[PDB]
From a paper:
Here, we present the first high-resolution cryo-EM maps and atomic models of WT aerolysin in a membrane-like environment and its Y221G prepore-like mutant. Upon prepore assembly, domains 1 and 2 of adjacent protomers interact through a series of salt bridges and H-bonds that greatly stabilize the cap region. Furthermore, the formation of the concentric β-barrel fold contributes to the stabilization of the prepore through the addition of over 10 H-bonds per subunit. Interestingly, five H-bonds consolidate the lumen of the concentric β-barrel being present both in the prepore and pore configuration. The prepore stability is further enhanced by the hydrophobic residues at the interface of the two β-barrels. Pore formation retains the tight network of bonds between protomers observed in the prepore, while introducing several additional interactions at the folded hinge regions. Overall, previously unseen interactions between side chain and backbone atoms can be observed in both prepore and pore conformations of aerolysin structures at high resolution.
Numbering used by the authors:
A (entry chain A), B (entry chain G): 1 to 424
């Protein structure tokens, strides 16, 4: 009923359905689901015990599952562990030009070069390392090629081994920069002093013999409030947001500012919104007198530095010849073929370029069309591959900074002046 | 980890990783990043010491970096200095016709001719100077050619040297004029006297036996306020602003005036906006009497001279033959080829025509596709090139003046007249 991950299966040679601690016999359906793996994990004429009086036979028997019994039995953890790839803390790159950010990314040995090199090594790529070292991911030269980057083992000096000198190459390209609204941060908030926006004056004249309250001067209508933004390092020209979001509330003044999706961050450097504030003055004027009235509207400015984080995605191409001894390609070629494969480090786009999709669906033999990650787990272990892929898929975020300003706080002043006799 | 600028590296011949004051040994990764420069800065079979027990070998060894040790060692400042091109104070040209502004720009020897001449000289152009002087950028003739300008060393009289008479030419063209809203300035502000815009009168008649307050006369609706602008010298026909901006607040009266981007400044010489002011009169009329009521609306005019600054950008083409001894083109040709290259003095447009981009990315050998600025630094020094490029890239701003007027201040008057008996 539940999915079965082949890496957790193990054969106990103890007797009829014995298994070990926290290990239970495997049933017929789970067997059939992972028959390819299980039969590849046993001898040609070997016969092993399943649950419910069933047995699975070796490749010589064509992997038949038949009712029977045997002295050994395949077993599965009663408390299986999830093999999901851990998500690590994001790697933060300081804001800068696009090329500078890429340069800082690809020259980080611990976080980029070594993880990708070890991934290529695990997948079966040959000569992932330079001649001046015997360890994977060492003595690697980084070069700028076109709009992308190439990391390749140094080939200077001599080398020993078959086709040594055909070093594996790791190519980075197709950089894209999203934007995370939730990553917003701001510096010191500066609020300017009240500034007089406009003023309207008037006179209320009463030449009658009784006081009059029948006056009304009203100032209303939409008042446009403008907001402005600046960009610092020029990477913003490539930054986009997949979903429209509102500018975050800073202080206690909400600005109805919308950032459009699928548009350059550097193109949206200003705008205006509407606020409706109305004021009115209705004086009571004594007989034979005039009263002056005034309505004033003031604005104020709020400004602060801003910093967002742009998620960085790219395309990682591994190019080189797969090792004869063992590689992770599902056909397991043994002719040392030249091979190129592109992964998309970032959001899912397709199954072939998605490490996470292939890793998660490794319990479905029919979905294994590119890489056999179960083979990698068997060769190197579950934890090792988990950590390596977590480092490879570690989120990378580039700073996006600037300055922001907006006319937000609005104030009013309504004045009824002293009466003046009409004799004037 | 951090970028390494080759101009700051220096070889100490002292012993095993000695270096000098505030100078540390260079590691393997930084070496590999700037290997081309470092290996070009050493002898064919020379061997120099890196950090962590590594050594870098000369061109004869093909620039190999291998674990080892040597009696000398490359070293890098522990407190590196930024080689960024300084930004100087803007050069202000008085407002005038386009041709006059260009004429004043290109005839400024100290600010335009000599800097560009020295830039061409540093890049390796030959004969940047006239025959009547032995110094660069002297005895240079300026001529109007089509819609652009040409500065070339005077070729009158005799000359000594190979291909003397093939003087280098500096061509200016492609002038563009932006506009900086923040550069706004205004002269003396003139406010006119209140002028009666409109008047509505009425009668409130009460033929009953009790006082009546049930009257209301209301004057409201949008009131169009017009603004006008004049242009003085005719350069405004070419002036445009990349971003829409609001007319600055002058005095304490905000005018909702928007200047459209990508449109001629001289085409936007007026407009109108809407302000909503409403007045009402609700008299209390005594029995058997009539009262006259009046509502008046007045406007006023605010006018002042205005001055903005238009940032001037242009295309600077250097044409001439590169010196055999040494030039800054990345291929370092030695056949004295005729060569033409255009820089864009102003906003970035492309890598090839951007001095700032090439200068900043000089630590990436793969981005060095046009000019080798590290070669210029080695030949002439960092400070010299910094100052020369700052003068070349010095911002230039042309005046844009005129007169501005707008109907801004609005006033009202509400009058309730004296009662008149109905016997009349």
């Amino acid at each position: 009923a539940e999915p079965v991950y082949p890496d957790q299966l193990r054969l106990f040679s103890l007797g009829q359905g014995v298994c070990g601690d926290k290990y239970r016999p495997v049933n017929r359906e789970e067997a059939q689901s992972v028959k390819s793996n299980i039969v590849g994990m046993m001898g040609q004429w070997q016969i092993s015990g399943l649950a419910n009086g069933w047995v699975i036979m070796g490749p010589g028997y064509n992997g038949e599952i038949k009712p029977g019994t045997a002295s050994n039995t395949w077993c599965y953890p009663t408390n299986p562990v999830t093999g999901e790839i851990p998500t690590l803390s994001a790697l933060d790159i300081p804001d800068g030009d696009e090329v500078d950010v890429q340069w800082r990314l690809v020259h980080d040995s611990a976080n980029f070069i070594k993880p990708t090199s070890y991934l290529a090594h695990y997948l079966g790529y040959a000569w992932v390392g330079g001649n001046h070292s015997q360890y994977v991911g060492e003595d690697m030269d980084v070069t700028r090629d076109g709009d992308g980057w190439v990391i390749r083992g140094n080939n200077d000096g001599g080398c020993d081994g078959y086709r040594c000198g055909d070093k594996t190459a790791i190519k980075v390209s197709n950089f894209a920069y999203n934007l995370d609204p939730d990553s917003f941060k701001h510096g010191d908030v500066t609020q300017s002093d009240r500034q007089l926006v406009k003023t309207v004056v008037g006179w209320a004249v009463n030449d009658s013999d009784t006081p009059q309250s029948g006056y009304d001067v009203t100032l209303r209508g939409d008042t446009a409030t403008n907001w402005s933004k600046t960009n610092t390092y020029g990477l913003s020209e490539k930054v986009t947001t997949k979903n429209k979001f509102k500018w975050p509330l800073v202080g206690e003044t909400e600005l109805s500012i919308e950032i459009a999706a699928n548009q350059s961050w550097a193109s949206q450097n200003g705008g205006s919104t509407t606020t409706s504030l109305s004021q009115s003055v209705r004086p009571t004027v004594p007989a034979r007198s005039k009263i002056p009235v005034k309505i004033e509207l003031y604005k104020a400015d709020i400004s602060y530095p801003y910093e967002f984080k742009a998620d960085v995605s790219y395309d990682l191409t591994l190019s080189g010849f797969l090792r004869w001894g063992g590689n992770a390609w599902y056909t397991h070629p043994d002719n040392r073929p030249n091979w190129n494969h592109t992964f998309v480090i970032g959001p899912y786009k397709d199954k072939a370029s998605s490490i996470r999709y292939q890793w998660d669906k490794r319990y479905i033999p029919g979905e294994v069309k590119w890489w056999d990650w179960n083979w990698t787990i068997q060769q190197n272990g579950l934890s090792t591959m988990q950590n390596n892929l977590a480092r490879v898929l570690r989120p990378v975020r580039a700073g996006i900074t600037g300055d922001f300003s907006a006319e937000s706080q609005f104030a009013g002043n309504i004045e009824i002046g002293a009466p003046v006799p009409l004799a004037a």
